[PDB]
Amino acid sequence: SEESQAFQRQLTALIGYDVTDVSNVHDDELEFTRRGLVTPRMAEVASRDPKLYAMHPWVTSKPLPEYLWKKIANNCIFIVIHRSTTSQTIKVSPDDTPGAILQSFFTKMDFVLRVCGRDEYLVGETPIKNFQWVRHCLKNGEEIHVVLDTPPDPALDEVRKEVSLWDCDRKFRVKIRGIDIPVLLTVFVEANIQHGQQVLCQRRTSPKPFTEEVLWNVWLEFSIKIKDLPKGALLNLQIYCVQLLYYVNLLLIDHRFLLRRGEYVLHMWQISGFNADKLTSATNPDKENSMSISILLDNYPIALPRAEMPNQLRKQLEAIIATDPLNPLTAEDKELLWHFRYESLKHPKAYPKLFSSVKWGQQEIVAKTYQLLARREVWDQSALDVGLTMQLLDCNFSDENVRAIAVQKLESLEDDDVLHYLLQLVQAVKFEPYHDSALARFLLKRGLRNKRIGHFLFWFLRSEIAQSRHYQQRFAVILEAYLRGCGTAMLHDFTQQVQVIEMLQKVTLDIKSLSSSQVISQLKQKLENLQNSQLPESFRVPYDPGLKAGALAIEKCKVMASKKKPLWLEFKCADPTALSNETIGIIFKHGDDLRQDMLILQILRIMESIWETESLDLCLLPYGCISTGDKIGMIEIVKDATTIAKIQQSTVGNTGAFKDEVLNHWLKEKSPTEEKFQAAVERFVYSCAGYCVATFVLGIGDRHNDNIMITETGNLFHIDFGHILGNYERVPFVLTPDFLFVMGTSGKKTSPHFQKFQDICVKAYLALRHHTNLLIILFSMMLMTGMPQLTSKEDIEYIRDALTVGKNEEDAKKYFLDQIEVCRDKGWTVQFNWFLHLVLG
Numbered sequence: 001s002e003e004s005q006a007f008q009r010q011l012t013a014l015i016g017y018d019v020t021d022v023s024n025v026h027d028d029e030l031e032f033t034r035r036g037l038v039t040p041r042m043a044e045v046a047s048r049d050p051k052l053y054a055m056h057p058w059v060t061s062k063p064l065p066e067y068l069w070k071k072i073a074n075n076c077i078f079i080v081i082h083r084s085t086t087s088q089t090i091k092v093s094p095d096d097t098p099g100a101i102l103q104s105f106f107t108k109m110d111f112v113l114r115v116c117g118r119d120e121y122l123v124g125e126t127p128i129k130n131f132q133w134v135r136h137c138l139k140n141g142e143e144i145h146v147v148l149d150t151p152p153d154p155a156l157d158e159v160r161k162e163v164s165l166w167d168c169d170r171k172f173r174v175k176i177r178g179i180d181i182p183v184l185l186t187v188f189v190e191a192n193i194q195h196g197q198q199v200l201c202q203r204r205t206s207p208k209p210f211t212e213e214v215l216w217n218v219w220l221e222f223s224i225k226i227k228d229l230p231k232g233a234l235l236n237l238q239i240y241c242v243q244l245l246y247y248v249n250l251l252l253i254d255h256r257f258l259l260r261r262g263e264y265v266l267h268m269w270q271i272s273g274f275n276a277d278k279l280t281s282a283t284n285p286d287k288e289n290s291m292s293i294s295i296l297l298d299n300y301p302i303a304l305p306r307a308e309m310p311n312q313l314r315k316q317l318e319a320i321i322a323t324d325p326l327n328p329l330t331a332e333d334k335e336l337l338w339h340f341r342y343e344s345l346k347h348p349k350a351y352p353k354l355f356s357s358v359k360w361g362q363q364e365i366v367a368k369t370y371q372l373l374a375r376r377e378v379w380d381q382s383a384l385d386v387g388l389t390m391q392l393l394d395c396n397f398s399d400e401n402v403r404a405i406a407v408q409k410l411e412s413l414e415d416d417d418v419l420h421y422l423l424q425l426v427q428a429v430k431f432e433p434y435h436d437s438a439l440a441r442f443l444l445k446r447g448l449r450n451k452r453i454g455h456f457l458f459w460f461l462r463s464e465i466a467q468s469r470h471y472q473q474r475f476a477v478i479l480e481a482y483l484r485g486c487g488t489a490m491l492h493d494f495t496q497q498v499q500v501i502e503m504l505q506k507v508t509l510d511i512k513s514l515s516s517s518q519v520i521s522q523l524k525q526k527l528e529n530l531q532n533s534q535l536p537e538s539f540r541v542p543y544d545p546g547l548k549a550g551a552l553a554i555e556k557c558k559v560m561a562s563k564k565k566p567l568w569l570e571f572k573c574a575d576p577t578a579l580s581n582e583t584i585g586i587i588f589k590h591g592d593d594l595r596q597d598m599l600i601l602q603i604l605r606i607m608e609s610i611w612e613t614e615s616l617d618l619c620l621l622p623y624g625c626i627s628t629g630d631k632i633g634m635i636e637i638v639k640d641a642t643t644i645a646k647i648q649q650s651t652v653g654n655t656g657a658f659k660d661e662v663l664n665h666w667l668k669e670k671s672p673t674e675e676k677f678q679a680a681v682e683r684f685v686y687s688c689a690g691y692c693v694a695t696f697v698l699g700i701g702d703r704h705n706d707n708i709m710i711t712e713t714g715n716l717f718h719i720d721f722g723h724i725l726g727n728y729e730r731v732p733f734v735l736t737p738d739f740l741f742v743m744g745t746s747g748k749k750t751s752p753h754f755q756k757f758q759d760i761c762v763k764a765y766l767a768l769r770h771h772t773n774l775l776i777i778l779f780s781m782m783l784m785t786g787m788p789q790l791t792s793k794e795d796i797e798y799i800r801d802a803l804t805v806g807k808n809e810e811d812a813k814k815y816f817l818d819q820i821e822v823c824r825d826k827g828w829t830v831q832f833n834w835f836l837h838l839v840l841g
């Protein structure tokens, strides 16, 4: 058609990348994937309930926590129903199904129950105690306001209609024609055959003089038969001089199972100054500058098609299965897992170590490994272990079938859990040898089945497309596939949103250039222009899709006194049913890598989710944060909060003479009573401990005073995680004298609140250790995909020591309290030191 020719231009401006383009491709893999994705896309669209998909109920099957049960009067929950302007407060049992609440309105005295101010509906067949919003009200002690109205039209979601390799004993060989850098030592090419970070063979070239062009025309005969080549095997080409400068990759087996034959000119990636970018099958799009390599792949079509056990052996094997994800496997260890593979198969915990013990560079081994994969009764049966599942999806596993068993294990996750691991499952796509994968398709099904998962999948993919050339092509193909099945309704939200954000990033960047009262002029001025026939009436808040932002409260908007000039924007809620008049506060900033903040913030939600399994509430504040392009993005403004340094500058003022008594005063000054004050002390002890533990585990505990905030209600929380991770005497974390003074203690004393503090830190700390493997994998994955240059290895290893791996709960609990002591002993040294650094250099 033509309407479908104008449509591709819409998607391209939505994706932020032109997919259809073929200027930076050397094969039809991406086109092949775009085609391949059409089936799971249309398959999912066809299978989704149009009503339940339109109202996207935000449910959960996890048992309502203890803290929220101890927060109920008597199996009675009050809901406030609203219509015209007329209210009503009804009684509801925690098992009161939503639809049956209308037979408690047409019997107690057609339509659906929406929420006041939010695009959240209380539809579907679930007990009310199971709606996120309900659990959110109960947690923070609030009234449940519903605005009974007409269900959205499912018609609005409507989608726009549409020779065997095993026969050559021939040793693999590659011809290095040469390299050529269009601009400038000695130089040598390094050709590696890899599979799951495991190096099968290595070759080189004679060191030639580093000139603007270098030729060899040499054949590099590897010590690997053509038939011993596994799918997902990479030819890795690196240029040294001794330091590496470029590298580029080529899959020695394509998407069609054919051995790669032909002439290749690969525009190579440069090094700066391990991470995910080094694994890409994508070539550099920039040719005017990029180093190039020319190679030849012989072009003669070659396609790719139980007894007993001793006692000390079982014990050595058990000692292997037990060991954490980062403990390396010796040659002796691997040879053991392999020989006793059938016994190793009975333990799902053995799968990452057992599959790492596989000699992938050998045809016969892979075969026995697939024979091993067919007898998967135990794995397929056992309860889902995300931590174990995440391990098979990392950089260590290039095998299609191994990776697929992990994806099938994810298939059982409810939407609630996909949203917890979404960001990291999307980052895990970088570990996929191919563009089309079970994981790529899994993210597609999940995004298309649920609007919340789909809204977030959009921004996550969009973020990557804009700031990563190594993966934008692949990610762009997944986003396009998502957009062709989400519906024209959401396809409209995504458009309003992109329009709004791009207008605001322009304002961010421009104001950043004019660097004063003069700045306060332009900002407000530009915020008037965009507020005309350019910016639409409203838009969904990208970090809170249930919120619609209206007009810009121009009077409240401003530039912040930072090295960079982030906008402090404020919007009216664009929804009349809104039970309040409070604005929507967003910070727009360029200069810090917001992807790192997203990662940590997401790990924080997981730690909050871990603590829920043990009825604990450490009151964390993982505020909304969406990366939108390079250095640029937005941040949720936490309401009624100040930095700990500002509370100090308030009654000491830019000095460093940190008063141990200030904070506790500030709280009383803010407290409407002496009671809400105790709740503010109650919330403090919790939030403080929560961040104390979580910050320590992640190794971001030693923070700046300016980089820590508190709410006028006791809620403490760290910020700028992309500050330390983005460039970083010492301390575990931050348990300053002003904090301890709020906990009734002084110097080397004790009080009931502080004893409580330590008892919360012990419960919390140990509660995370029951999830060691999970946290290790997430931390490990995060550093490989989000903290570039900050990989080394000794960086990953940090988390092992923090979680005190191998230690008993008793060795651990002691370690933490002593970690707390480093604070009591340091007092203000650290803070005063950061002051001596962070404000005076």
Ligand SMILES: COc1ccc(NC(=O)c2cccc3c(N)nc(C)nc23)cn1
Pocket: 587, 589, 592, 593, 594, 597, 623, 635, 636, 637, 638, 639, 641, 719, 720, 721, 722, 723
């Ligand atoms: C490194 O990325 C960043 C950058 C800034 C921030 N936050 C702030 O600068 C910042 C400043 C003032 C108020 C707030 C606030 N109320 N809430 C939040 C999250 N951040 C704030 C968090 N992460």
